[PDB]
Design a protein around this ligand. Structure first.
Ligand SMILES: Brc1cnn(C2CC[NH2+]CC2)c1
Ligand SMILES: [Zn+2]
Length: 106
């Protein structure tokens, strides 16, 4: 399933922060649910699998050191919600950071 790069959200029923927050319930996973929701994510109920309301992008297997906004930019860089909330400069930094993180050890 291709990522949504239009200015229109794929799941408008999940456009409000509060709506997204209800999807998690009791959340045992290593990444904060408030932080996930702020980054546009809602829970699917399949372990720690989340989806962005706007781009439709799915993310799974969260480690405690990982950041929702960073991961969002890493895997769904065409997301218009992401661009709205963070700006292109932030997004550029993240890409550069990760691409460089490769030629550090990898
Ligand atoms: Br595409 C995709 C699905 N999950 N992910 C990562 C999310 C953060 N944990 C490591 C995996 C990328
Ligand atoms: Zn998105």
């Amino acid at each position: 399933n291709f990522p949504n790069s239009t200015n229109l959200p794929r799941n408008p029923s999940m456009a409000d922060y509060e709506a997204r927050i209800f999807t998690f319930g009791t959340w045992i996973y290593s990444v904060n649910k408030e932080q996930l929701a702020r980054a546009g994510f809602y829970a699917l109920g399949e372990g720690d699998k989340v989806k962005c309301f706007h781009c439709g992008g799915g993310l799974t297997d969260w480690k405690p050191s990982e950041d929702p906004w960073e991961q969002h930019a890493k895997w769904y860089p065409g997301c218009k919600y992401l661009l709205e909330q963070k700006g292109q400069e932030y997004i550029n930094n993240i890409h550069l950071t990760h691409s460089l993180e490769e030629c550090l050890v990898r």
